[PDB]
Design an enzyme around this catalytic site. Structure first.
Site, short mmCIF file in Angstrom:
data_model
loop_
_atom_site.label_atom_id
_atom_site.label_comp_id
_atom_site.label_asym_id
_atom_site.label_seq_id
_atom_site.Cartn_x
_atom_site.Cartn_y
_atom_site.Cartn_z
N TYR A 1 35.72 -8.53 8.73
CA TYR A 1 34.40 -7.99 9.03
C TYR A 1 33.34 -9.07 8.89
CZ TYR A 1 31.22 -3.96 9.60
OH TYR A 1 30.35 -3.01 10.10
N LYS B 1 36.02 -7.57 13.49
CA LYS B 1 34.84 -6.93 14.04
C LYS B 1 33.78 -8.00 13.78
CE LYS B 1 31.22 -3.49 13.51
NZ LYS B 1 30.57 -2.46 12.66
#
Ligand SMILES: [K+]
Ligand SMILES: [K+]
Ligand SMILES: [K+]
Ligand SMILES: [K+]
Lengths: 283, 283, 283, 283
Positions: free
Chosen positions: D124, D152
C-alpha cells in the site's frame, strides 16, 4: 564583520543604472566593514555578462569588498572572475552550478578548485534562491584549500553552522540569515553578510559587538528588536529591500521586470522600519 | 508529433562547436517532425548571450522548429526572442524566471504576456531543472491568449496532463517525460518532445501511431520496450545523452565543464541502447 | 532544565519490558531535572493503548515528569490524557494529528484547546517523525492559553526559536535538537529535552550552566565537544540510542520489530561515546 | 476491477457507528467488484485496536474484500492480521511503518515478509497520508513472493505504474488515484480502488470497460467527465467524501474529531456531484 549585499539599481524600465549603483555603494560603505557586490540580493543573475562587467567598473569601493559569482559553467565563470580580480575584489562568493546540478557529481569540487586556483573565494550556500544543496561533505573536502577562505551560509540551518564550528579550522563562517543572527554567532560565525545591514548596519554591528564582549543580555534584547526587520525583509526579498532603500532616500532603483516595483509586504514593513529609524538604528 | 531536444555540442575544453551543432541537427531532423533548439537538454543556460546567438545562426533547420528561451528577466529575454524570430523559429518554449521566483507574484503572467505579444510560444514546465512551479491556475489564465499555443510539460506529473485535457481547449499539450509517454497520450497529449527521441525517434513515432490508430496492445508493448531507455536516460541527463550520441557516431560533443564527459550510468545504458539498435529501433 | 526522552524497553521479540522500563527511569532520573516519558524517542506510537497504560503504571518518577501524547483524534487522546493525569504527570507534550493533517484546518486549534481544557501541556513539534508542520501562526494563537505552557521544538529550525523569543511571552521554549543546543539557548530556549541527555546528562547541564552564567567561551567549547555525539545520535535514531544505553549497561532493551536491534552507525558512534566516557562526561 | 475504500462512520461525537458501517457497506457492495475496508479513506488509524476489531466484526461482505492494515510494528500488526483473516478477507493492503521510517532500513522487507508469511497482501503506497516512500527497489524485491499479490499505488506518480508494467510480472497493479485513472490503465493497472467509486462506481467501471474494449475515444470522454469529481474529492479528503455520501442519503457519518464535519470545498463540489447525478452516473 558586517557586510551588506548591496542591490543593483535598475530604472523602472529595467535599464542598469551605473550612476545610482555607484552612489548607493558610497552611501553605505562608510557604515559597514565592506561590501558584497552581486550577492544573492544583488540581482547578478539578472545581468548579461556585458552589464555585469559594466556595473562593477562603475564602482570604486574604498574598503575590501567581495563579489558574488553565480555561473553555471567554468567557461562562463572565467570572465566573471577576471572582472572581479581586475576590480580589486578581496575574494569571490561563488554558488554551485544550478540547472543540471543533479548531474554535476564530483564536478562540484572541480568547479571550486578551478576557481580557487585563480582567486580566493568563499563558498556561497543560499538554497532559497539557487535551490541546490552544498553538502557538508563537500564543504569539508574543500575547506583545506588555501584559497577557499570560508563560506557564506544563508540557509538559516544552524546545524550547518554548528558543523563548521566543531569540525572546521582555518574556515571563516559568515551567516546570511538575519533572523537567527545571534544564534549563528553563538555557534561560531565570524559575522554576517545581511540584506538587513543595508538598512540598519549599525544595529547588527552593535549586536555583534555585544556578543563579542560577552554582553549576552544586551545581545539578546537587540536580537529580539531586530527580528521583525530581518524576518519581514526575508519574506519580501529584493522588491522589499529596494523599496525600503528608496523610501529612505537612497538610489536603490527597482527590481528588473517582470519583478514588481513595490512589495506586497510594504504596509507591514513600513512601521517596522520607521520604528527602528525613530530609535536611531537606521543607516 | 515527435520532436527531440537536440544537445548543443562543446569540445572537451567547453568551446561551442558550431560545425558539430549544424551537423548534428541535419543528422536528426529527417527522422523527426521538427527540432527543439536550446531545450532543457540543450544547455542553453550554459551559453552567454553571444554564444546563444552564434549557435542558432549556425543552424539551418528545414522543418518547423522550436527554440527554448530560459531567461530571468524581460530585458534578458528580449534579445533571445529577437534572435529566435530572425532564425525563423515557429515558436518559443519559455520557462518561468527562476532565481527570485518566490517574489515574482503576478509577474509570472506579465512575463509570458510580454513575450506572447511579440511571438508565439509554448509554456515550458520542467521543474526537475528550473526547480520552480508553474501553477495550473497560471496555465489556465494564460491559455486563452492567442499566442500561447500550449505547453511542454516535462514534470512526469500526469495529474497536470489530465487537467489540461479536461479543462483546456485550444491548448496543445506536449509531454517531455519519456517513461510515462503512453500514459500522457491516453490523457490527451498531442505528442512528445523527448530527449530519448534523439536516439530512437522512429520508435516513439511508432508508439504515437499505434495509439492514434487504436492499436492499444501494440502501443503498450512498445511503451514497455522503450521504458528502460527513457528511464535510464532521465537519470543520466545531458552527460548520458551526449555520450550515447557520440557512441552512435553523431557529433554531440561533451557537456560544458565542470560537468562530466562520461556518465556513471554508461555501463547500464550501453546494453539497453545496443539492444534497441539490434532490434532496428535506433536512429 | 535538562530532561531526557527515555526509551521504552522491549525484549528482542518486541514484548514490553515493564521491569526494565522502571529500572531505566530510576537510573537516569537522579542525573536530570525530570523525565519525558513517551517522547519521540520513546516509541509511544509503537504501543497499543493497553501497553501504553501498562508502561506508565510501571513507572514511579520522583521528579516532575512529562508524558508525550501522540494520537490522531480526540477520542483516542482522551484515554492517554486520563492515564497521564492519574500518573501525576506535570504536563503533556502533544503532537498534532498526522495521517489526515491536510484536512485538519482549524481542527488543529480545536485539538489543543480540548486537551488544554483538561491538562497543562507543551506543544510538540518534531516534524522529522510526525512529518507535519505546526505553523508559527498556530503557536501564537495557542500561546495565550493558560494551560499551553510552551513548546518542545525538535525541528532544528532556529528561525522558529527566534520567533518564540521575539514574539511570545509566558511561553516556555524547549529545544529537542542537540547539535544546535547552544544556538537555541542564545535564542531564548529555557532548556533542552534531548535524547543525548540519556547518555551525557551532566554535560548538557554544564553547557546550559556555562551559558546562564555568561561563560560563553566555555559554553562554545563544550558545544563543540558534544556536537559529534548529538549529530550521530540524531542520525542513528532510536536503534542507536538503545544500543548505546545497553552498551553502558542500562536496560534500554531493543527497538520493536521490524526495527533493527543494532544501528549501522555503531562503529562510528562507539569511539565517540567511549571518548566522552573517558573524559568523565557520561552518565 | 473497481473497488471503493469505504469510510468508517462515526457520529458527531466521534463514536464508532457499527450499524451505520454495516448499512453503508451493504448499500455500496452491489455496485462494485468488492470493498476495501480500512483503506486510506477509511480512518483505520483513527480507531483503537478494540474499535478496529469491533468495526470489522460488524460487517458481512458478500463479495471478496480487502482490509487495510496500517501499523507501526509487527506486534501491533499481528492482531490486525488475525482479525482480517478471521473476517474472511481476501487479502491485506499494508502500508510501511511510518513514525521511525528513516531508521527502518532492511526492516521494510522484514515487515512485509513477516505479514506475507501469514496472509496474502497488496503493498500500500499512499505517501500523501503516510508521508513515507516505498522504493521501487523494495517493490521489485518483494514482487517475487507468492503472497505479495501486487500493489495499490495512490501516489499519482505514473512513472511508478509504468515501472511495474515494464519490469514486474505476476504483480497486480491497482491505482488509488482517480484524476489520472485512464493514464494508469494505459500503463497497465488492473483497475482502481478509488474513493470516487463510493459516489460514481458505475462510471469508473464504464471507463475501465471502454479501455478494455478498445473504445479509446469513449474512454477519454468519460475520463474528462470524471476528472472534476476525482480532482475535487482528492482535495477534500475524508470530510468531503463523508459529506457527499451523507448528502446522497447514505450513513457515512462524520470524520472523527478534531476533523471537520463539513468540507470547505462543499460549495464547489455540490454542483459537480449533482451534475453527474443528473446524468445518471451516481450510485
Ligand atoms: K582554507
Ligand atoms: K491559446
Ligand atoms: K501560556
Ligand atoms: K507475486
Amino acid at each position: 564583520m558586517i557586510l551588506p549585499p548591496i542591490p543593483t539599481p535598475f530604472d523602472r524600465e529595467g535599464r542598469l543604472d551605473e550612476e545610482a549603483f555607484r552612489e548607493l555603494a558610497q552611501a553605505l560603505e562608510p557604515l559597514v566593514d565592506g561590501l558584497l557586490v552581486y550577492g544573492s540580493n544583488g540581482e547578478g543573475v539578472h545581468l548579461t555578462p556585458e552589464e555585469r562587467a559594466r556595473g562593477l567598473r562603475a564602482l570604486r569601493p574604498r574598503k575590501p569588498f567581495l563579489v558574488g559569482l553565480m555561473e553555471e559553467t567554468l567557461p562562463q565563470a572565467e570572465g566573471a572572475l577576471l572582472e572581479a580580480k581586475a576590480a580589486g575584489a578581496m575574494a569571490l562568493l561563488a554558488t554551485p552550478p544550478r540547472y543540471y546540478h543533479g548531474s554535476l557529481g564530483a564536478g562540484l569540487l572541480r568547479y571550486y578548485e578551478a576557481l580557487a586556483e585563480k582567486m580566493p573565494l568563499f563558498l556561497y550556500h543560499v538554497p532559497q534562491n539557487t535551490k541546490v544543496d552544498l553538502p557538508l561533505e563537500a564543504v569539508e573536502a574543500l575547506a583545506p584549500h588555501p584559497n577557499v577562505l570560508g563560506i557564506k551560509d544563508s540557509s538559516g540551518d544552524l546545524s550547518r553552522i554548528a558543523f563548521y564550528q566543531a569540525r572546521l579550522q582555518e574556515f571563516r563562517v559568515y551567516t546570511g540569515h538575519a533572523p537567527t543572527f545571534l544564534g549563528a554567532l553563538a555557534l561560531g560565525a565570524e559575522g554576517g553578510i545581511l540584506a538587513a545591514a543595508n538598512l540598519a548596519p549599525r544595529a547588527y554591528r552593535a549586536l555583534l559587538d555585544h556578543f563579542r564582549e560577552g554582553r549576552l543580555a544586551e545581545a539578546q534584547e537587540l536580537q529580539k528588536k531586530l527580528f521583525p526587520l530581518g524576518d519581514l525583509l526575508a519574506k519580501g526579498g529584493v522588491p522589499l529591500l529596494k523599496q525600503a532603500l528608496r523610501h529612505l532616500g537612497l538610489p536603490a532603483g527597482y527590481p528588473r521586470p517582470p519583478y514588481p516595483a513595490e512589495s506586497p509586504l510594504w504596509e507591514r514593513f513600513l512601521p517596522v522600519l520607521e520604528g527602528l529609524k525613530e530609535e536611531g538604528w537606521v543607516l
